[PDB]
Ligand binder design. Structure first.
Ligand SMILES: CCCCCCCCCCCCCCCCCC(=O)OC[C@H](COP(=O)(O)OCCN)OC(=O)CCCCCCCCCCCCCCCCC
Ligand SMILES: CCCCCCCCCCCCCCCCCC(=O)OC[C@H](COP(=O)(O)OCCN)OC(=O)CCCCCCCCCCCCCCCCC
Ligand SMILES: CCCCCCCCCCCCO[C@@H]1O[C@H](CO)[C@@H](O[C@H]2O[C@H](CO)[C@@H](O)[C@H](O)[C@H]2O)[C@H](O)[C@H]1O
Lengths: 459, 57
C-alpha cells in the first residue's frame, strides 16, 4: 500500500511548499492523480485476496472503499475552497492538511491486516474529523457537536479495545488472514454475550444504529461542507466495514445477539424516514436520510448471507456518493442564502435550471430508481431479509414508500413552486459547483454498467 | 622456673594440635535448595522481532 500511502503524505509537502495562490490547484490536481492510480487495486482474484505484506492487504471489500476514499479528497477540496477564501493562508494549509491526514488514516484503516492496527487508525480518524468540525464550523453549536461526536465514538471504542486484546490473548493473533483459519465458535454464556457486545457496539455507533444516532444530525448540521462529505461518504462506512470483518469470529452467537439490533434497524429505518418528512433543516434532512439507509446495511450485515453481504457492499458505495452529492447540493444553496432552512428559498428550478437537474438526479438515486447501484444494493438486501423472514417485506415496502415521499418533497419544496420574492442574490451556478455535482453523479451512474466491482468479496 | 609472659604474648593467636575430628555440619544445616536451572546458549535475534501486535520489527 506504500504506492498510495507515500504519495498521500507527499500531498502535505506539496500544499505547504505551493505558491500562495496555487494551494488549491496543486492539491486538487495531484489528489486526482492519486485517485487515478487507486484503480490498480482492482487486481482481485476469485479465491485469494490481494495480500501485499505483513501489514496491508486489499480484498474486494476494501478495494471499492479505498477508491471511494481517494476520489473524495479532490471533491472535498473543490467544495471547500470557496468558503475558505477569506481564510488566513496558513489556516488554509492547515485545513487541507487535516483532509490529507484523514485520507491517510482512512486508506490505512481499510487495508490493515491486523485488527489492532485497524483499531488505532479507525480511532485516529477522530482527531482530524473533530478539528474540522469545531475549528471551521460556522455556528455556536459546533462545539457541542464535537463533544457528542467524540464521546459517542469513544464510549463504544474503548470496550472494543478490551475485546480485541482479549481475543489476541486467547487466540494468539489478530491478523485477519489468521483469524479465517483459527476461528473457533462462540458458545453461549454471559461472558460471550458481553464479548459480542464489545465487538459490535463501536461499529454500531459509527453506522449509526437507530437509538445511538443522535450524534450524527448534530455533527452534520455543524460541520463544514468538506467535513459533512467525508462524514457521510466514508466515516459512516467504517462501522459497516468493521462489522463485516469482525462478524467472522462471532459465530454462531450472532444468531440470537442480532435480534435486538435487527429490530432497532427495521423499525428505526421507518422512524428516521418519517422524521425526514417533517424536517425544517435541509442538512438535517439529509443526515436523517443516512440513518435510514444505513439501517439496511446493519440488517444485511447481521443476517449473514451471501446476498446480504453483496447488497451491503453496494449500498455503502452508492450511499457514499449520493449523500455526499446531496450535502454538496444543499451547500450551494447555503453559500447563496446562508441558511439551511429548507422552506426559505423555493422555486429554484426557475432561477438555476441546470442545478435543478442535479437536484433531480440526486433525488432519483436517493429513492433508489432502478437500475442505479442505489437500487441494486437496496434490492439485494430486501431479497435476503425476505428469506430471513417473509414479514420483513412489509417494513421494507413501507420504507421504500416513505423514502420516495421525502426525497421528492425535498425536490419539490426547494426547486418547484414559486421563487421567494425577497431573495435576490441567487447568482448563476459556477463552473466549480456544476463540475462538483457532475463528479458525484457521473461515476455513480457509470458504475451501473459494471456493478460487479462494488459487490464485495462474496460476488 | 616460671617466666612471666611479655606484653603481647597472651593475645597471640596460637595453633593447637587436637585428635578430635573437625565437625562436619556444626550448624546442623539442612540441604540447600537446588539453584534455578541455568540459562545458557547462543543469544540469537528475537524470532520475528518484538511480535507486539502488528509490529514487524
Ligand atoms: C461502561 C463503563 C462503566 C461500567 C464499567 C464497565 C465494566 C463492566 C462491564 C462488565 C462486562 C462483563 C465482562 O467484563 O466480562 C468479563 C469476562 C471475564 O471472563 P474470563 O474469566 O476472562 O474468561 C473465562 C470465562 N470464565 O470477559 C471475557 O470473558 C471476555 C470479554 C471480552 C471483553 C468484554 C469487554 C466488556 C464490554 C462491556 C461493555 C460492552 C457494551 C458497550 C456499550 C457501549 C454503548 C455505547
Ligand atoms: C508514522 C507513519 C504513519 C503516519 C500515520 C500514523 C499511523 C498511526 C501511527 C500508530 C503506529 C502505527 C504504525 C504502523 C507501522 C508500524 C509497524 C511497522 O511498520 O513495522 C515495523 C517497521 C518496519 O517496517 P517494514 O515492514 O519492515 O518495512 C521496511 C521498509 N523499508 O518499523 C517501525 O516500526 C518504524 C516505522 C514507523 C512508520 C513511520 C516511519 C517510516 C519511515 C519514514 C520516516 C520518514 C523518513 C523521511 C524523513 C523526511 C525528513 C523531512
Ligand atoms: C442490546 C442488549 C442485547 C442483550 C441480549 C441478551 C441475550 C441473552 C442471552 C441469555 C443466554 C446466555 O447464555 C446462557 O448463560 C448461562 C451462564 O450462566 C449458561 O448456563 C450456565 O449458567 C447457568 C446458571 O444460570 C447454569 O444453569 C448452567 O448449568 C450453566 O451451564 C447457559 O448455558 C447459556 O445458555
Amino acid at each position: 500500500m506504500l504506492k498510495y500511502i507515500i504519495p498521500t503524505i507527499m500531498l502535505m509537502p506539496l500544499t505547504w511548499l505551493s505558491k500562495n495562490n496555487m494551494i488549491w490547484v496543486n492539491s486538487t490536481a495531484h489528489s486526482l492523480l492519486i485517485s487515478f492510480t487507486s484503480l490498480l487495486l482492482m487486481n482481485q482474484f476469485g479465491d485469494n485476496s490481494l495480500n501485499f505484506s505483513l501489514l496491508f492487504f486489499s480484498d474486494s471489500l476494501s478495494t471499492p472503499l479505498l477508491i471511494l476514499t481517494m476520489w473524495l479528497l479532490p471533491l472535498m477540496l473543490m467544495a471547500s475552497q470557496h468558503h475558505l477564501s477569506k481564510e488566513n493562508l496558513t489556516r488554509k494549509k492547515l485545513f487541507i492538511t487535516m483532509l490529507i491526514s484523514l485520507q491517510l488514516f482512512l486508506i490505512m484503516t481499510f487495508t490493515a491486516m491486523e485488527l489492532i492496527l485497524f483499531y488505532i487508525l479507525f480511532e485516529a480518524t477522530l482527531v482530524p474529523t473533530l478539528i474540522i468540525i469545531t475549528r471551521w464550523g460556522n455556528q455556536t453549536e459546533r462545539l457541542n457537536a464535537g463533544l457528542y461526536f467524540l464521546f459517542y465514538t469513544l464510549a463504544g471504542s474503548l470496550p472494543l479495545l478490551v475485546a480485541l486484546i482479549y481475543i489476541q490473548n486467547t487466540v494468539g493473533s489478530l491478523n485477519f488472514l489468521m483469524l479465517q483459519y483459527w476461528v473457533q465458535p462462540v458458545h453461549n454464556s454471559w461472558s460471550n454475550v458481553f464479548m459480542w457486545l464489545a465487538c459490535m457496539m463501536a461499529f454500531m455507533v459509527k453506522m449509526p444504529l437507530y437509538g445511538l444516532h443522535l450524534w450524527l444530525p448534530k455533527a452534520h448540521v455543524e460541520a463544514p461542507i468538506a467535513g459533512s462529505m467525508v462524514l457521510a461518504a466514508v466515516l459512516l462506512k467504517l462501522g459497516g466495514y468493521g462489522m463485516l470483518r469482525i462478524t467472522l469470529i462471532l459465530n454462531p452467537m450472532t444468531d440470537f445477539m442480532a435480534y435486538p439490533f435487527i429490530m432497532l434497524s427495521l423499525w428505526g429505518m421507518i422512524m428516521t424516514s418519517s422524521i425526514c418528512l417533517r424536517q425544517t433543516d435541509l442538512k438535517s434532512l439529509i443526515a436523517y436520510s443516512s440513518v435510514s439507509h444505513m439501517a439496511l446495511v446493519i440488517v444485511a450485515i447481521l443476517i449473514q448471507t451471501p446476498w446480504s453481504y453483496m447488497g451491503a457492499t453496494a449500498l455503502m458505495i452508492a450511499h457514499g456518493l449520493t449523500s455526499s452529492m446531496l450535502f454538496c447540493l444543499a451547500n450551494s444553496n447555503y453559500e447563496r442564502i446562508h441558511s439551511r432552512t429548507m422552506i426559505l428559498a423555493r422555486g429554484l428550478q426557475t432561477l438555476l435550471p441546470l442545478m435543478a437537474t442535479w437536484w433531480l438526479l440526486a433525488s432519483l438515486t436517493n429513492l433508489a430508481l432502478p437500475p442505479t447501484i442505489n437500487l441494486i444494493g437496496e434490492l439485494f438486501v430486501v431479497m435476503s431479509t425476505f428469506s430471513w423472514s417473509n414479514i420483513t417485506i412489509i417494513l421494507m415496502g413501507v420504507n421504500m414508500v416513505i423514502t420516495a415521499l421525502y426525497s421528492l418533497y425535498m425536490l419539490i419544496m426547494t426547486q418547484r413552486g414559486k421563487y421567494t420574492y425577497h431573495i435576490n442574490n441567487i447568482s448563476p451556478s459556477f463552473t466549480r459547483e456544476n463540475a462538483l455535482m457532475s463528479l458525484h453523479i457521473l461515476p455513480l451512474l457509470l458504475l451501473t454498467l459494471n456493478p460487479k466491482i462494488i459487490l464485495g468479496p462474496l460476488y | 622456673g616460671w617466666v612471666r609472659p611479655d606484653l603481647g604474648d597472651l593475645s597471640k593467636v596460637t595453633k593447637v594440635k587436637t585428635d578430635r575430628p573437625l565437625p562436619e555440619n556444626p550448624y546442623h544445616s539442612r540441604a540447600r535448595p537446588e539453584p534455578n536451572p541455568e540459562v545458557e546458549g547462543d543469544l540469537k535475534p528475537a524470532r520475528h522481532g518484538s511480535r507486539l501486535f502488528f509490529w514487524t520489527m
